[PDB]
Amino acid sequence: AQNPNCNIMIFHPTKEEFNDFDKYIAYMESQGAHRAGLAKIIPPKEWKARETYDNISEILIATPLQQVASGRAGVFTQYHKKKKAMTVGEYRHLANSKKYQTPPHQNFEDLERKYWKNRIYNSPIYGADISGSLFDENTKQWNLGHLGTIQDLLEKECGVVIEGVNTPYLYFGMWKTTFAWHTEDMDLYSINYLHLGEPKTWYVVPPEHGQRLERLARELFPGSSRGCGAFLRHKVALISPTVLKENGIPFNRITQEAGEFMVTFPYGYHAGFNHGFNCAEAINFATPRWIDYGKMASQCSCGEARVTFSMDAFVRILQPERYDLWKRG
Ligand SMILES: CCOC(=O)Cc1nn[nH]n1
Ligand SMILES: [Cl-]
Ligand code: NA
Ligand code: NI
Ligand SMILES: [Zn+2]
């Protein structure tokens, strides 16, 4: 079997290989990439997402979220406090201010150490989950607004014809902005392009070991676990690499830089943080291999994890038994 140690693999497709998106995902999996839960794809040198980023400052962040931590440095939750709307230009200025700017650091490992030491003592502001795209409509390869839809995938695989749309999200980040441990909705794939700015560090647990992370999370967040049997769905719990290592949890880490794609694979738990001001775009997608993961995906029914209108049909068709109870939440 390929990639038995579940290492994060990095791919360098040629411009010809970059034409057929589905085919390249299948290729990566043939090499065992999915075993890690996460892969990096560096686009060919001939490719670009758009011409420039000089004109993005007027995009609105309608509901920036302040990420307020509780707990200890290595085991904490974050709750999201709504702030007043800002433009991207205003947000960038805020990110670069003394209060929020990345501290001096020697390299990525030094900054990673500073993040886990000091994250809880600050409350950075994240402009997450903004419907939109920054790919030029003329970019034909790996344009995250022009992928095949999950609804069409389900139809092709299962004959299933369903309502729903699937469009990309933009994210504007700053130092210490954090994505909590999660898998995607319905354990879908995701793809993330870092358009501009400072890096993003990722942590990931191999899909074959996801239940080990879940068990540790239940132990570390016992009240949350009693409240919901899928509380990681809430996307608020953080566990540091030190604590994961202490508890024998298999994981890997990698830093994504501007101009690079990351793909997360079905049931690949991931978490991480932004190094400084940046802009990313992401969307969920499916392949034939996803279908069995979708059938088995845990669900939050406590009501906290509120989700997109597209998810109804996925639960309805793939998980009819669970549908009524899920719909209640
Ligand atoms: C407000 C919390 O926002 C997030 O966690 C957004 C995010 N999800 N994955 N990377 N960023
Ligand atoms: Cl710091
Ligand atoms: Na490893
Ligand atoms: Ni994700
Ligand atoms: Zn829940």
Ligand nearest to the CA of 262: 4
Residue 34 assigned as binding residue: no
Q: Return the percent helix, strand and coil in the chain, to nearest 5.
A: 30, 25, 45
**Amino acid in the structure at residue 193:** Y
Question: Residue 303, class by beta-carbon neighbours within 10 Å (0-12 exposed, 13-18 middle, 19+ buried)?
Answer: exposed
The answer to whether the beta carbons of residues 150 and 284 sit under 8 Å apart is yes
Q: Are 119 and 273 in contact (CB under 8 A)?
A: yes
The atom of ligand 1 lying closest to the CA of 126 is 1
Residue carrying structure tokens 């870092």:
194
Helix H or strand E segment including 296: helix 290-296
d(CA 32, CA 27): 9
From the CA atom positions of the chain, what is the Rg in Å?
19
Nearest residue (CA) to ligand 1, atom 3: 128
- Residue 19 has phi, psi (to 5 degrees) of -75, -50
- Which has the closest alpha carbon to 193: 281, 111, 109, 73? 281
Pair of tokens at residue 219: 């132990």
Amino acid 143 reads N
Instruction: Identify the DSSP state of 54.
Output: T
Q: What is the DSSP letter of 107?
A: S
Chain-centre distance for alpha carbon 98? 28
Pairing type for strands 75-82 and 65-72 reads antiparallel
Bridge partners, residue 125, by sequence:
66
For residue 188, the CA-to-ligand 4 centroid distance in Å is: 9
CA 14 from chain center: how many Å? Answer: 25
Contact indicator for 175, 53 with CB cutoff of 8 Å: no
Which residue out of 171, 200, 262 has the highest number of ligand 1 atoms within 8 Å of its CB and is therefore the one to mutate?
A: 171
195 in a known ligand binding site: no
Contact 136, 146 (CB under 8 A): no
Among candidates 95, 124, 73, 38, which has minimal Cα distance to 242?
A: 73
Count CA within 13 A, CB hemisphere, residue 74: 10
Phi then psi for residue 189, to 5 deg, are -70, 160
Burial code (b: 16+ CB inside 10 Å, e: under 16) for 60-83 equals: ebeebbebebeeebbbbbbebeee
- Across-strand partners of 192? 262, 282
Instruction: Map residue 5 onto helix, strand or coil.
Output: coil
Instruction: Return the best residue to mutate from 68, 176, 179, 270 for the ligand 1 pocket (most ligand atoms within 8 A of CB).
Output: 179
CA-CA distance, 175 to 272, in Å (whole number)? 11
Between strands 278-285 and 169-173, the pairing is antiparallel
Minimum CA distance residue for ligand 1 atom 8: 179
Distance CA 307, CA 292 (A): 21
The helix (run of H) or strand (run of E) holding residue 152 is helix 150-158
Query: From CA 269, how far away is CA 206, in angstroms rounded?
Result: 7
β-pair partners for 147: none
Determine the Cα–Cα distance for residues 193 and 170; give it in Å rounded to an integer.
10
Q: How far apart are CA 161 and CA 11, in angstroms?
A: 34
The minimum-distance atom of ligand 1 relative to the CA of 65 is 1
Of 271, 188, 203, 260, whose CA–CA distance to 40 is shortest?
260
126 is in an annotated binding site: yes
CA of 110 to the centre of ligand 3 (A): 20
Q: Are 126 and 177 in contact (CB under 8 A)?
A: yes
Question: Closest by alpha carbon to 101, among 85, 119, 124?
Answer: 124
Identify whether the C-beta of residue 283 lies closer than 8 Å to the C-beta of residue 130.
no
Q: Which CATH number fits domain 1-329: 3.40.47.10, 3.40.50.1860, 1.10.940.10, 2.60.120.650?
A: 2.60.120.650
Distance of alpha carbon 139 from the chain centroid: 23
Residue-range domain boundaries for the chain: 1-329
| One-letter identity of residue 238 | L
Adjacent-strand bridge partners of 281: 170, 193
Output the residue whose Cα is nearest ligand 1's atom 9: 179
The whole-angstrom separation of Cα 293 and Cα 129 is 24
Residue 207 amino acid letter: P
Assigned token pair, 264 = 């997360």
Pocket of ligand 1 (CB under 6 A): 65, 80, 126, 128, 171, 179-180, 235
Q: How many CB atoms lie within 10 A of CB 1?
A: 5
Coil, strand or helix at 170: strand
Closest-CA residue to 227 (of 297, 299, 302): 302
In the sheet with 252-256, reading across from the earlier edge strand, the strands are 178-182, 269-274, 200-205, 252-256
Query: Running DSSP on this structure, what letter comes out for residue 43?
Result: P
Tokens of 200: 């993003």
